[PDB]
Write a protein that binds this ligand. Structure first.
Ligand code: NA
Length: 287
């Protein structure tokens, strides 16, 4: 009858609503405190350190995110108990925070890339953006690119794959196009660093262009859009990973050209003006 009735939890619930908190926030916190209490077999306001530690370690096979969230709800509960004068101690002081979960940044969207392609900019800025977003190049790969790395007749380029093993990538038509406006032999981005610009200024350029385009993210996020947008266009996971030179593949699987035609047909589907990507697929191209 009274089992599982936790009058003090309901007091906290009412208090939280009066702080203008939402039902979503409050009911999730209350459910967590009740879950811990029922599993431990204790009234939630009297739970002791070792019970809470046991529940956070053994009450479920929690993900890192779930454990982090649960720790925060328990911290809010016990801090409230102490602050309101209901309990002298706070057992969470004795419990180290769990592993901070990976913060999932905002993925760059097709509309973001549209605006990035539309910002007025020097052609070297446009080239850096195109290499990141439409070839998946990392900023140090962009910085060192030379005209003599590109075959515009065969529409290919050479870049480092895994380790020291060279890879041959098909060129997106947008990159072929800007390549004919760039040096056909020397560095695209001349600078003091082995003849080219520093990777830091390539990163800084892409970052400033994204701010100007109203886009949050970085050059890395454009390489992630490259993979994400390829998957959204129907390209199969393995081909995307080859086009990205993803390190889950071996240098041989990356540098092989048995799949040249699938790769070339895949990369050409990339169109920010345009097939269902899941949390599982996205983890396949993550880095
Ligand atoms: Na409080």
């Amino acid at each position: 009858g009274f089992k599982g009735q936790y009058p003090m939890v309901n007091r906290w619930r009412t208090w939280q609503f009066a702080q203008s908190l939402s039902a979503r926030t409050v009911e999730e916190r209350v459910a967590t405190v009740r879950r811990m209490a029922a599993w431990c077999g204790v009234e939630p306001e009297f739970a002791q350190v070792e019970q809470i530690v046991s529940w956070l370690a053994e009450g479920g096979n929690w993900s890192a995110r779930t454990r982090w969230t649960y720790y925060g709800a328990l911290s809010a509960w016990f801090l409230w108990l102490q602050q309101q004068g209901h309990r002298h101690d706070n057992p969470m002081v004795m419990i180290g925070r769990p592993k901070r979960p990976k913060s999932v940044p905002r993925p760059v969207s097709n509309l973001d890339v549209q605006r990035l392609l539309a910002v007025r900019a020097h052609k070297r800025t446009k080239a850096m953006i195109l290499l990141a977003a439409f070839q998946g190049l990392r900023v140090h790969e962009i910085a060192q690119i030379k005209g003599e790395h590109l075959d515009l007749i065969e529409r290919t380029m050479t870049v480092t794959g895994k380790g020291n093993v060279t890879a041959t990538l098909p060129l997106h038509h947008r990159v072929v196009e800007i390549a004919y406006q760039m040096p056909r032999r020397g560095h695209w981005f001349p600078g003091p660093d082995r003849g080219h610009q520093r990777r830091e200024s390539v990163s800084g350029t892409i970052k400033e262009a994204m701010i100007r385009a109203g886009v949050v993210g970085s050059a890395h996020c454009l390489r992630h859009w490259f993979g994400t947008a390829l998957l959204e266009a129907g390209v199969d996971l393995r081909t995307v990973q080859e086009l990205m030179r993803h390190q889950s593949l071996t240098s041989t699987e990356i540098a092989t050209r048995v799949t040249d035609q699938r790769r070339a047909e895949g990369i050409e589907r990339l169109d920010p003006f345009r097939t269902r990507v899941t949390d599982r697929l996205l983890a396949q191209i993550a880095e």
